[PDB]
Amino acid sequence: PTPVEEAQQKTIEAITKAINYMAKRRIGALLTIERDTGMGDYIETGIPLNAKVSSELLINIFIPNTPLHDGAVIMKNNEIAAAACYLPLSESPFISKELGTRHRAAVGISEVTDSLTIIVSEETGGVSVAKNGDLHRELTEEALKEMLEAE
Amino acid sequence: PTPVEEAQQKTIEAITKAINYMAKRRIGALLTIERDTGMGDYIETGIPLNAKVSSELLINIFIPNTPLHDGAVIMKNNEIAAAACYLPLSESPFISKELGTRHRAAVGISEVTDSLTIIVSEETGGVSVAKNGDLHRELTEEALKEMLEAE
Ligand SMILES: COc1cccc(C(=O)n2cccc2)c1
Ligand SMILES: [Mg+2]
């Protein structure tokens, strides 16, 4: 594999390890991966990080009662661009009624970009992904990893 | 002021805001600012960030009982280079005997570099600075700012 491909694999490994840990601990999380539609307008609403990705940094961002935990992390390739970002809220009727703002924000950004957003529920620990206006819930660890690899 | 001057002042303000937050909550912290002596060997022992400085990120790094909080943050060229870094423990017999390994690590790096290290005590929330092999204890906010500006 090329350096670009190896870097992508390392970033996938960092994301999945972080998400798997937050799911086990019921740590709510909202992580949007920019794709070909630029998300600068949303990145600029958060706290700039421009940080190398690591599982450790991803988890710490979302620890409850901390400055960075409310709002979305937006990643650009192999960097965490910003945290505590605003995303627009979807009004889609296909969002389970019991779900809160993180899931609605994820679907919302997925309606106006080609990004992939991962959500961890603080209520159940369930992991979901929003893409192209659809929310896919209750993902296994294997399914999430495959989704990211395909992305 | 010049761009460089404004950037230095912004970073000092971000540091002092984070230190004040951790002192109030008695969150142990260890933050070393690289100066003329290169610290790459110590940076390489931690988790790479190369992140923009913010008080928010500093606070979200230093969360008790997290891997990212286990060691020193090292700053270089107005960025957070890495977190959870190793620093050498001082063997000086002239450090206050009630202080533990955090303060000995700060003094230790200050014995072999021209860096400035800030320490927040998890026992008391007291703020200290290590430079040139000495520990300056029980600093006020004004005292810490003066040290950062002098540095
Ligand atoms: C010690 O419990 C914690 C608490 C918060 C964050 C982490 C962490 O950074 N990781 C967990 C698995 C890989 C990375 C661990
Ligand atoms: Mg299902």
CSV table of C-alpha atoms and ligand atoms in Angstrom, one decimal:
chain,number,residue,atom,x,y,z
A,1,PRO,CA,0.0,0.0,0.0
A,2,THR,CA,1.0,3.6,-0.6
A,3,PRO,CA,1.7,6.1,2.2
A,4,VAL,CA,-1.7,7.6,1.6
A,5,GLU,CA,-3.4,4.2,2.0
A,6,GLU,CA,-1.4,3.4,5.1
A,7,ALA,CA,-2.3,6.8,6.7
A,8,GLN,CA,-6.0,6.1,5.9
A,9,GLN,CA,-5.7,2.7,7.6
A,10,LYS,CA,-4.1,4.3,10.7
A,11,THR,CA,-6.9,6.9,10.9
A,12,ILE,CA,-9.6,4.3,10.5
A,13,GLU,CA,-8.0,2.3,13.3
A,14,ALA,CA,-7.8,5.3,15.6
A,15,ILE,CA,-11.5,6.2,14.9
A,16,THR,CA,-12.8,2.7,15.5
A,17,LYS,CA,-10.9,2.2,18.7
A,18,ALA,CA,-12.2,5.5,20.0
A,19,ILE,CA,-15.8,4.8,19.0
A,20,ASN,CA,-15.7,1.3,20.4
A,21,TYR,CA,-14.5,2.6,23.7
A,22,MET,CA,-17.0,5.4,23.9
A,23,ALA,CA,-19.8,3.0,23.1
A,24,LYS,CA,-18.8,0.7,25.9
A,25,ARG,CA,-18.8,3.6,28.4
A,26,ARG,CA,-22.0,5.2,27.0
A,27,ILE,CA,-20.0,8.4,26.1
A,28,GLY,CA,-22.0,10.4,23.6
A,29,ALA,CA,-20.1,11.3,20.5
A,30,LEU,CA,-20.6,13.1,17.2
A,31,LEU,CA,-17.9,12.7,14.6
A,32,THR,CA,-18.2,14.0,11.1
A,33,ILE,CA,-15.6,12.9,8.4
A,34,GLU,CA,-15.4,15.5,5.6
A,35,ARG,CA,-15.4,13.9,2.1
A,36,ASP,CA,-15.6,15.8,-1.2
A,37,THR,CA,-18.0,18.4,-0.1
A,38,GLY,CA,-16.0,21.0,1.8
A,39,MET,CA,-17.3,21.7,5.3
A,40,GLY,CA,-15.3,24.9,6.1
A,41,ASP,CA,-18.4,26.8,7.1
A,42,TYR,CA,-19.1,24.3,9.9
A,43,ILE,CA,-15.5,23.8,10.9
A,44,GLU,CA,-15.2,27.5,11.5
A,45,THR,CA,-18.0,27.4,14.1
A,46,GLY,CA,-15.9,25.2,16.4
A,47,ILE,CA,-12.7,25.4,18.3
A,48,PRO,CA,-9.8,25.0,15.9
A,49,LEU,CA,-7.5,22.0,16.6
A,50,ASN,CA,-5.9,21.0,13.3
A,51,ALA,CA,-4.5,18.1,15.3
A,52,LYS,CA,-3.1,14.7,14.3
A,53,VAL,CA,-5.7,12.0,14.9
A,54,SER,CA,-5.4,9.6,17.8
A,55,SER,CA,-7.9,7.4,19.6
A,56,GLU,CA,-6.9,9.1,22.9
A,57,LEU,CA,-7.6,12.6,21.7
A,58,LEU,CA,-10.9,11.6,20.1
A,59,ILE,CA,-12.1,10.0,23.4
A,60,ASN,CA,-11.0,12.9,25.6
A,61,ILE,CA,-12.8,15.5,23.4
A,62,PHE,CA,-16.2,13.9,24.3
A,63,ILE,CA,-15.7,13.3,28.0
A,64,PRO,CA,-18.8,14.8,29.7
A,65,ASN,CA,-18.6,18.2,31.4
A,66,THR,CA,-15.5,19.3,29.4
A,67,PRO,CA,-15.1,22.4,27.1
A,68,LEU,CA,-15.0,20.4,23.9
A,69,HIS,CA,-17.6,17.7,24.4
A,70,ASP,CA,-20.7,19.5,23.1
A,71,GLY,CA,-21.0,19.7,19.4
A,72,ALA,CA,-19.4,17.9,16.5
A,73,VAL,CA,-15.8,16.9,15.8
A,74,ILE,CA,-15.1,17.4,12.1
A,75,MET,CA,-12.2,15.5,10.6
A,76,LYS,CA,-10.4,16.4,7.4
A,77,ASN,CA,-8.5,13.4,6.1
A,78,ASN,CA,-6.0,12.5,8.8
A,79,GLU,CA,-6.6,15.5,11.1
A,80,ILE,CA,-9.1,16.6,13.6
A,81,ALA,CA,-9.9,20.0,12.1
A,82,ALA,CA,-12.1,21.4,14.9
A,83,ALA,CA,-14.3,20.3,17.9
A,84,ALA,CA,-17.5,21.6,19.4
A,85,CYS,CA,-18.8,22.5,15.9
A,86,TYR,CA,-22.3,23.4,14.9
A,87,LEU,CA,-24.2,21.1,12.5
A,88,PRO,CA,-27.7,21.8,11.1
A,89,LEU,CA,-30.5,19.8,12.6
A,90,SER,CA,-32.4,17.5,10.3
A,91,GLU,CA,-36.2,17.6,10.3
A,92,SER,CA,-36.4,14.1,8.6
A,93,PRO,CA,-39.3,12.0,9.9
A,94,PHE,CA,-37.2,8.9,9.7
A,95,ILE,CA,-35.1,9.7,12.8
A,96,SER,CA,-36.3,7.6,15.7
A,97,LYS,CA,-38.4,9.8,17.9
A,98,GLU,CA,-36.4,8.9,21.1
A,99,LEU,CA,-33.1,10.2,19.6
A,100,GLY,CA,-31.8,13.6,20.6
A,101,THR,CA,-29.8,16.4,19.1
A,102,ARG,CA,-26.6,14.6,18.2
A,103,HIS,CA,-28.4,12.2,15.8
A,104,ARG,CA,-30.5,15.0,14.3
A,105,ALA,CA,-27.3,17.1,13.7
A,106,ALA,CA,-25.6,14.1,12.1
A,107,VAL,CA,-28.5,13.5,9.7
A,108,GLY,CA,-28.7,17.2,9.1
A,109,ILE,CA,-25.1,17.6,7.9
A,110,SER,CA,-25.5,14.4,5.9
A,111,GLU,CA,-28.4,16.0,3.9
A,112,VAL,CA,-26.2,18.9,2.6
A,113,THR,CA,-22.8,17.1,2.3
A,114,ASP,CA,-21.3,13.8,1.2
A,115,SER,CA,-19.8,13.4,4.7
A,116,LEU,CA,-20.0,10.3,6.9
A,117,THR,CA,-21.0,11.0,10.5
A,118,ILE,CA,-20.7,8.6,13.4
A,119,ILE,CA,-22.8,9.0,16.5
A,120,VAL,CA,-22.6,7.2,19.9
A,121,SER,CA,-25.7,7.3,22.0
A,122,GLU,CA,-25.2,8.3,25.6
A,123,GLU,CA,-28.4,6.5,26.4
A,124,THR,CA,-27.7,3.1,25.0
A,125,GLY,CA,-24.1,3.0,23.7
A,126,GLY,CA,-25.5,2.2,20.3
A,127,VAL,CA,-23.4,3.3,17.3
A,128,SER,CA,-25.0,4.8,14.2
A,129,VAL,CA,-23.9,6.4,11.0
A,130,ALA,CA,-25.5,9.2,9.0
A,131,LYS,CA,-24.9,9.4,5.2
A,132,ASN,CA,-26.9,11.0,2.4
A,133,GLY,CA,-29.8,11.8,4.7
A,134,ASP,CA,-30.2,8.3,6.1
A,135,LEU,CA,-29.4,7.1,9.6
A,136,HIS,CA,-28.2,3.5,10.1
A,137,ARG,CA,-28.4,2.4,13.7
A,138,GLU,CA,-27.1,-0.3,16.1
A,139,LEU,CA,-23.9,-1.0,14.1
A,140,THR,CA,-21.6,-3.8,15.1
A,141,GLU,CA,-17.9,-2.9,15.5
A,142,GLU,CA,-17.2,-4.9,12.3
A,143,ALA,CA,-19.9,-3.0,10.3
A,144,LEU,CA,-18.6,0.4,11.3
A,145,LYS,CA,-15.1,-0.6,10.3
A,146,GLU,CA,-16.3,-1.9,6.9
A,147,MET,CA,-18.3,1.3,6.3
A,148,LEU,CA,-15.2,3.5,7.0
A,149,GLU,CA,-13.0,1.3,4.8
A,150,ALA,CA,-15.5,1.6,2.0
A,151,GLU,CA,-15.8,5.3,2.5
B,1,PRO,CA,1.3,44.9,17.9
B,2,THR,CA,2.8,42.7,15.2
B,3,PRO,CA,1.2,39.3,14.2
B,4,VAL,CA,3.9,37.4,16.1
B,5,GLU,CA,3.3,39.5,19.3
B,6,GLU,CA,-0.5,39.0,19.1
B,7,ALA,CA,0.0,35.3,18.7
B,8,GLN,CA,2.3,35.0,21.7
B,9,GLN,CA,-0.2,37.0,23.8
B,10,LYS,CA,-3.1,34.8,22.7
B,11,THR,CA,-1.1,31.7,23.6
B,12,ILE,CA,-0.2,33.1,27.1
B,13,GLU,CA,-3.9,33.8,27.7
B,14,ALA,CA,-4.9,30.3,26.6
B,15,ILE,CA,-2.4,28.8,28.9
B,16,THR,CA,-3.3,30.9,31.9
B,17,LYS,CA,-7.0,30.2,31.4
B,18,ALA,CA,-6.4,26.5,31.3
B,19,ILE,CA,-4.1,26.6,34.4
B,20,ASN,CA,-6.7,28.6,36.4
B,21,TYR,CA,-9.4,26.0,35.5
B,22,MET,CA,-7.2,23.1,36.6
B,23,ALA,CA,-6.0,24.9,39.8
B,24,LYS,CA,-9.5,25.5,40.9
B,25,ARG,CA,-10.4,21.8,40.4
B,26,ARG,CA,-7.1,20.5,41.7
B,27,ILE,CA,-6.4,18.7,38.4
B,28,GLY,CA,-2.8,17.7,38.2
B,29,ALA,CA,-1.1,19.0,35.1
B,30,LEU,CA,2.4,19.2,33.5
B,31,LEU,CA,3.0,21.6,30.6
B,32,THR,CA,6.5,22.1,29.2
B,33,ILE,CA,7.3,24.9,26.8
B,34,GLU,CA,10.3,24.2,24.6
B,35,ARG,CA,12.8,27.1,24.2
B,36,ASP,CA,16.2,27.1,22.6
B,37,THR,CA,17.1,23.5,23.7
B,38,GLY,CA,15.5,21.0,21.4
B,39,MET,CA,13.1,18.6,23.0
B,40,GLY,CA,12.4,16.3,20.1
B,41,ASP,CA,13.5,13.2,22.0
B,42,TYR,CA,10.9,13.9,24.7
B,43,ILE,CA,8.2,14.9,22.3
B,44,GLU,CA,8.6,11.6,20.5
B,45,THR,CA,7.7,9.6,23.7
B,46,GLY,CA,4.2,11.0,23.7
B,47,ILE,CA,1.1,11.0,21.6
B,48,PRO,CA,1.5,13.4,18.6
B,49,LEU,CA,-0.9,16.3,18.3
B,50,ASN,CA,0.8,19.2,16.5
B,51,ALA,CA,-2.4,21.1,17.4
B,52,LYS,CA,-3.4,24.7,17.7
B,53,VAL,CA,-3.3,25.9,21.3
B,54,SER,CA,-6.6,26.6,23.0
B,55,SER,CA,-7.6,26.6,26.7
B,56,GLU,CA,-10.3,24.2,25.7
B,57,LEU,CA,-7.9,21.6,24.2
B,58,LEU,CA,-5.5,22.0,27.2
B,59,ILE,CA,-8.3,21.3,29.6
B,60,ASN,CA,-9.6,18.3,27.5
B,61,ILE,CA,-6.1,16.9,27.5
B,62,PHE,CA,-5.6,17.0,31.2
B,63,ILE,CA,-8.6,15.0,32.2
B,64,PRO,CA,-7.8,12.9,35.3
B,65,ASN,CA,-7.4,9.1,34.8
B,66,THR,CA,-7.1,9.3,31.0
B,67,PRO,CA,-4.1,8.1,29.0
B,68,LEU,CA,-3.8,11.6,27.4
B,69,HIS,CA,-3.4,13.1,30.9
B,70,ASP,CA,-0.6,10.6,31.9
B,71,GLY,CA,2.5,12.7,31.3
B,72,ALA,CA,3.6,16.1,30.0
B,73,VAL,CA,2.2,18.2,27.3
B,74,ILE,CA,5.1,19.7,25.3
B,75,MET,CA,4.6,22.9,23.4
B,76,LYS,CA,6.8,24.0,20.5
B,77,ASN,CA,6.5,26.7,17.9
B,78,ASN,CA,3.2,28.0,19.3
B,79,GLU,CA,1.5,24.6,19.0
B,80,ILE,CA,0.9,21.6,21.3
B,81,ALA,CA,3.4,19.2,19.9
B,82,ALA,CA,2.5,16.1,21.9
B,83,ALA,CA,0.7,14.9,25.1
B,84,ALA,CA,1.5,12.2,27.6
B,85,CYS,CA,5.2,12.7,27.2
B,86,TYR,CA,8.0,11.4,29.4
B,87,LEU,CA,10.1,13.8,31.3
B,88,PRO,CA,13.2,12.8,33.4
B,89,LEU,CA,12.8,12.7,37.1
B,90,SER,CA,15.0,15.1,39.1
B,91,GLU,CA,17.2,13.6,41.8
B,92,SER,CA,17.6,17.0,43.4
B,93,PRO,CA,17.5,16.7,47.2
B,94,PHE,CA,16.2,20.3,47.4
B,95,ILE,CA,12.7,19.9,46.1
B,96,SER,CA,10.0,20.2,48.8
B,97,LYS,CA,9.6,16.7,50.4
B,98,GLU,CA,5.8,16.8,50.1
B,99,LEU,CA,5.9,17.0,46.3
B,100,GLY,CA,5.7,13.9,44.1
B,101,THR,CA,6.7,12.7,40.7
B,102,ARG,CA,4.9,15.4,38.7
B,103,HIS,CA,7.0,18.2,40.2
B,104,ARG,CA,10.2,16.1,40.1
B,105,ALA,CA,9.6,15.5,36.4
B,106,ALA,CA,9.3,19.2,35.8
B,107,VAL,CA,12.4,20.0,37.7
B,108,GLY,CA,14.2,17.1,35.9
B,109,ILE,CA,13.5,18.5,32.4
B,110,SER,CA,14.5,22.0,33.6
B,111,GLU,CA,17.9,20.7,34.7
B,112,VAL,CA,18.9,19.6,31.1
B,113,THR,CA,17.0,22.2,29.0
B,114,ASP,CA,16.2,25.9,29.0
B,115,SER,CA,12.5,25.1,28.9
B,116,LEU,CA,9.8,26.4,31.2
B,117,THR,CA,7.4,23.9,32.8
B,118,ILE,CA,4.2,24.7,34.6
B,119,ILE,CA,2.8,22.3,37.2
B,120,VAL,CA,-0.6,22.1,38.8
B,121,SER,CA,-0.7,20.1,42.0
B,122,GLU,CA,-3.5,17.5,42.2
B,123,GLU,CA,-3.2,17.7,46.0
B,124,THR,CA,-3.6,21.5,46.5
B,125,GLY,CA,-4.2,23.1,43.1
B,126,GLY,CA,-1.1,25.1,43.7
B,127,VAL,CA,0.7,26.3,40.6
B,128,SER,CA,4.5,26.2,40.2
B,129,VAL,CA,7.1,26.7,37.5
B,130,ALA,CA,10.3,24.8,36.9
B,131,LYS,CA,13.2,26.5,35.2
B,132,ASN,CA,17.0,26.0,35.4
B,133,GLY,CA,16.7,23.3,38.0
B,134,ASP,CA,14.6,25.3,40.4
B,135,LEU,CA,10.9,25.1,41.3
B,136,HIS,CA,9.0,28.3,42.0
B,137,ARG,CA,6.0,27.4,44.1
B,138,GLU,CA,2.6,28.8,45.1
B,139,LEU,CA,2.4,31.3,42.2
B,140,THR,CA,-0.4,33.8,41.8
B,141,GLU,CA,-1.9,34.3,38.3
B,142,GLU,CA,0.0,37.6,38.0
B,143,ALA,CA,3.3,35.8,38.8
B,144,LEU,CA,2.7,33.1,36.2
B,145,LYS,CA,1.9,35.6,33.5
B,146,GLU,CA,5.0,37.6,34.4
B,147,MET,CA,7.1,34.4,34.0
B,148,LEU,CA,5.5,33.5,30.6
B,149,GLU,CA,6.0,37.1,29.3
B,150,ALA,CA,9.6,37.2,30.6
B,151,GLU,CA,10.2,33.8,28.9
C,1,LIG,C1,-8.4,4.6,31.2
C,1,LIG,O1,-9.6,4.7,30.6
C,1,LIG,C2,-9.7,5.7,29.5
C,1,LIG,C3,-10.4,6.9,29.7
C,1,LIG,C4,-10.4,7.8,28.7
C,1,LIG,C5,-9.8,7.6,27.5
C,1,LIG,C6,-9.1,6.4,27.3
C,1,LIG,C7,-8.3,6.2,26.0
C,1,LIG,O2,-7.6,7.1,25.6
C,1,LIG,N1,-8.3,4.9,25.3
C,1,LIG,C8,-9.0,3.8,25.6
C,1,LIG,C9,-8.6,2.7,24.5
C,1,LIG,C10,-7.7,3.4,23.5
C,1,LIG,C11,-7.5,4.7,23.9
C,1,LIG,C12,-9.0,5.5,28.4
C,2,MG,MG,-30.5,-2.9,12.4
